[PDB]
Design an enzyme around this catalytic site. Structure first.
Site, PDB file in Angstrom:
ATOM      1  N   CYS A 145       0.856  -1.207   0.000  1.00 29.37           N
ATOM      2  CA  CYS A 145       0.000   0.000   0.000  1.00 29.37           C
ATOM      3  C   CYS A 145       0.881   1.243   0.000  1.00 29.37           C
ATOM      4  CB  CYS A 145      -0.909   0.059   1.216  1.00 29.37           C
ATOM      5  SG  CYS A 145      -2.354   1.108   0.931  1.00 29.37           S
TER       6      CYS A 145
ATOM      7  N   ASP B  74       0.122   3.685   1.590  1.00 32.97           N
ATOM      8  CA  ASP B  74       0.136   3.910   3.067  1.00 32.97           C
ATOM      9  C   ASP B  74       1.440   3.325   3.614  1.00 32.97           C
ATOM     10  OD1 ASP B  74      -2.576   3.832   2.150  1.00 32.97           O
ATOM     11  OD2 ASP B  74      -3.310   2.688   3.861  1.00 32.97           O
TER      12      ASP B  74
ATOM     13  N   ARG C 185       3.407   2.864   5.768  1.00 27.90           N
ATOM     14  CA  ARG C 185       3.539   2.991   7.240  1.00 27.90           C
ATOM     15  C   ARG C 185       4.989   2.656   7.605  1.00 27.90           C
ATOM     16  NH1 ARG C 185      -0.706   5.852   9.317  1.00 27.90           N
ATOM     17  NH2 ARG C 185       0.707   5.629  11.096  1.00 27.90           N
TER      18      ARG C 185
ATOM     19  N   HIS D  26      -1.700  -4.315   4.852  1.00 33.24           N
ATOM     20  CA  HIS D  26      -1.406  -3.803   6.214  1.00 33.24           C
ATOM     21  C   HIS D  26      -2.714  -3.431   6.921  1.00 33.24           C
ATOM     22  CE1 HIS D  26      -2.002   0.612   5.799  1.00 33.24           C
ATOM     23  NE2 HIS D  26      -1.966   0.264   4.503  1.00 33.24           N
TER      24      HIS D  26
ATOM     25  N   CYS E   6      -5.331  -0.145   6.817  1.00 37.85           N
ATOM     26  CA  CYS E   6      -5.130   0.416   5.451  1.00 37.85           C
ATOM     27  C   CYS E   6      -6.343   1.261   5.055  1.00 37.85           C
ATOM     28  CB  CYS E   6      -4.898  -0.647   4.379  1.00 37.85           C
ATOM     29  SG  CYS E   6      -4.620   0.061   2.728  1.00 37.85           S
TER      30      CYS E   6
HETATM   31 ZN   LIG Z   1      -2.795   0.806   3.106  1.00 37.63          ZN
END
Ligand SMILES: [Zn+2]
Ligand SMILES: [Zn+2]
Ligand SMILES: [Zn+2]
Ligand SMILES: [Zn+2]
Lengths: 210, 210, 210, 210
Positions: B38, B40, B42, B94, B97
Site C-alpha cells: 500500500c 500507506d 507505514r 497492512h 489500510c
Molecule cells: Zn494501506
C-alpha cells in the site's frame, strides 16, 4: 517455513524497539508529503529525508514514471492530494537507476521496455541537450535528472492538480533527485505551486545547458 | 528554500552514518525479493523484514492492488522477475489500510474510488465469508487479509509468472499481511510455486471460515 | 502504393454516393448513444441498429471489456456522457467472439491473455451457473451474454456514471448482445437508470438459471 | 421497451438482406487489417475502405491515441498481430475530430482531458512546425495529421511489433487520415515495415514544412 528467515529477522526487529512506541506510529496523523520514486527502492523515502515512517505517502514504479493516463499512479495522487490534503508532491529520481540505464542503453528487457518508452520519450525531447555531454556517466545523470522534471510536468498537467489549485488548495510539486552513492539529495530548482509552469521549468532545464 | 527543513534533516542523516558504507549499498548486487504494498507506506519493506535497503525491490499502489491489466505494476513484475531473477514475489496488505477502510465503508473519495472497486470486488466475491464476522474490526482485518490473497491470485494468473514457471525459473508468490499496531507479520499459508493454484489458496481462504 | 487497392475501393465508394450528402454527415449534431463492443467488429454499431454513422459514439476493445481502472475506456465514457450528454450507454457482446472463445477454452495467446483474465473472472464468478449447461455452444453463448452484464455492472460502478446520476443527468446503461449468425439482437432485460442496481441485474442473471 | 425503436430499426435491417448471406459473414476467415480510430466513429473502417465488415479488426479510443503502456490498445494489437497475423496495422485520424479540437483549444472537459494530454504532447513536440500555419483550420488539420503519425511511431516502438519483425512476420504500419467532409482518404507517405523508422517518418513530417 519458505521465509522462516524473514519472520525471524522480524521478531528480531520488533524486540529491538523496547521504546513502547508502535502505538506512536499507529497514532501518526495524515502524511503531508507524496513521494513518487523508482521500484529500485535503494533507500526508503522517509529514512533519506529523516522523517518517521508514514509521515511520507509513497508510490513506486520502474523509473518513477508519471503517465498522463496511468490510473495506478493518478489514483495514488487523487487520494494523497484530495483526501490526505498533503502540502507537497515530489517525483524523486535516483542516480544509477536500472530503468533509466536499461532505456538509455536501448537494452531489450521484455514488457517493461514498453513502460521505459516513457523514459526514451524524455531522451528524444532533450536529444539536443543530451549530446553536449558527449559521455556516459554525465548523460546518464543528466537524463535521470530531466526524467524527474518531465514527470513533474506530467503531475502538474493532471486534472487532479489543476482542479486542486482551481479550488484554492495550497500545493507544490518538486522535481528532485538523490544519489545512492553519497546519500546527498539534489534540489533541481523545480517546485511548482500555481500553473506559472512554462517559467518555473525552462529555468530548471536551462541549469544543464552545456 | 520551500523544503529547507528536509535537505536539513538529510545532511543530518548522512552525518549519522560515519560507518563509511554508502559505498556498501551502491555495491549491493540484485534484489531477491519483490514486495507489492500500500502507498500507506507505514513501514519500509526492508525495515520490517530486517534487511538492508534495496535488498527488496518495491511497488506501492493504494491497497496493494494487482490489476490483470495495470501495466504500472506488471512492468514492475516483468522487470523484477525476468531481469533481476528475484526468488520470491509477495503482496503485503497492512491492518488499518485507508484504501480498504474507505472501500469497505463505501466512502465516496473521487477518482481512487474507481481503483478501490478492485477491493470492493473482493468484498463481493467473499460476501458470504465476511458476514459470519458480524462486526467491524473483525471483517476489516479479514477483508485486508483476503485482499492480499486475491492479489496473489492476480499475480499468479499474469502471463509473466506462468511463462517464468513454464521456462523452469524457480519462483514463489506469498499472500502476506502485517500490523502497523504490533509490527508482527502474519503468514497466511499462501505461497504458490507452480500452478497447483486452486489447492494452495482454498487452504488459505478456508483459514477464515467462521 | 502498398494499399493502392484500398484507396481504389475508396474513390469507388465516394462515387457510389451521388446523393450530395457527406455535407449531411458533417452536419450531424451530437450522438445520443455510446456503444462499447469487441474489436471483432463483425458489424458496425450504427448499421446493425439501422442508424446513420456517427449517430453512435463507439469504443472497441477485445471482448468489450470495461475495467474499473482502464482509462482508455473511462476516457471514452467521461467524454460521451459528460460532454456529448448521450442518453444511453450500452455494452454489446457478440456470439462467436474470439476473445471469449480463446479465454473460455483457456487458450494461451500471449499478452491479450492478461486482458482476457477479465473475462475468465466472469467465468469464475458464475462458475456454478455455467455448469448446468454441460455443453460448449450453450455455455459459450451464456458466457458472452453474462460478460455483457458484468461489464455494465462495471460501467455503473464507475464514478463518472454515479456522479452523472448524482447531478440529475438522465442516463441508462444496457447489457446487450447480437448474433453475427442471424443479425437479430437480444435484449437481456439489463438496462439500469439509477443505482437500483442489485435488483435490475439479479433479474437479468436469473434469466439463465438452468 | 426503452429502445423499442432500435430493435425495430433492426428487424427492419435484417429483412433488407434477402441475399441469404449472414451465413457468408459468419464464414469470413481472419481479418488482414487492424484499424485504430477515434471513438468519433463518423464512418465504419470497412465502409470507408469499401470492404466487407469484419474484414477489418478495429479499436476506437478518443483521438485514436496509442499509449506506450495502454494495455486496452496493446492487447488489441498483440491479438490482431500475433494471433490473426494481419498484414497491415493503420492508425486513422479524422478531420473535425472532437478530441483533437478540444485539446488543441485547451478546453477543460474533465477526465478525458488526461488522455488528451497525449494529443497536447504532439502539439508540444511539433510546436514550431504548427506556428508557420498561423491559422485555425490549417493547424487543426496539420495537428490531427501529425497525431496519426506519432501514434504510428508509438505502435512501431511497441515490443509486440519489434518482436513480430524480429521473428520475420511480414507487417507494415500506416499513418493515415480521412475527411468526414469529402470521404476521400489521405495517404501521409507514412507506412513502416522494418525499423528503418527515423528515415520513413522525417519524410512524412517534412511534407508539412510551411
Ligand atoms: Zn494501506
Ligand atoms: Zn531506479
Ligand atoms: Zn468479439
Ligand atoms: Zn475523432
Amino acid at each position: 517455513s519458505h521465509l522462516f528467515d524473514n519472520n525471524d529477522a522480524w521478531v528480531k526487529r520488533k524486540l529491538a524497539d523496547d521504546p513502547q512506541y508502535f502505538s506512536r506510529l499507529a497514532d501518526q496523523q495524515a502524511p503531508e508529503y507524496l513521494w513518487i520514486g523508482c521500484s529500485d527502492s535503494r533507500v526508503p523515502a522517509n529514512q533519506i529525508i529523516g522523517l518517521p515512517p508514514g509521515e511520507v505517502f509513497v508510490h513506486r514504479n520502474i523509473a518513477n514514471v508519471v503517465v498522463h493516463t496511468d490510473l495506478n499512479c493518478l489514483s495514488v495522487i487523487q487520494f494523497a492530494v484530495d483526501l490526505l490534503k498533503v502540502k507537497h508532491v515530489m517525483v524523486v529520481g535516483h542516480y544509477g537507476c536500472s530503468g533509466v540505464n536499461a532505456a538509455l542503453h536501448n537494452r531489450r528487457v521484455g514488457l517493461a521496455d514498453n513502460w521505459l518508452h516513457h523514459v526514451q520519450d524524455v531522451r528524444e525531447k532533450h536529444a539536443a541537450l543530451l549530446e553536449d555531454w558527449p559521455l556516459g556517466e554525465a548523460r546518464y545523470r543528466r537524463l535521470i535528472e530531466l526524467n524527474a522534471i518531465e514527470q513533474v510536468v506530467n503531475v502538474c498537467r493532471t486534472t487532479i492538480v489543476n482542479d486542486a489549485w482551481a479550488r484554492g488548495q495550497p500545493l507544490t510539486v518538486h522535481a528532485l533527485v538523490y544519489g545512492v552513492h553519497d546519500g546527498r539529495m539534489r534540489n533541481l530548482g523545480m517546485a511548482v505551486s500555481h500553473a506559472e509552469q512554462l517559467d518555473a521549468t525552462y529555468r530548471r532545464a536551462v541549469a544543464a545547458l552545456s
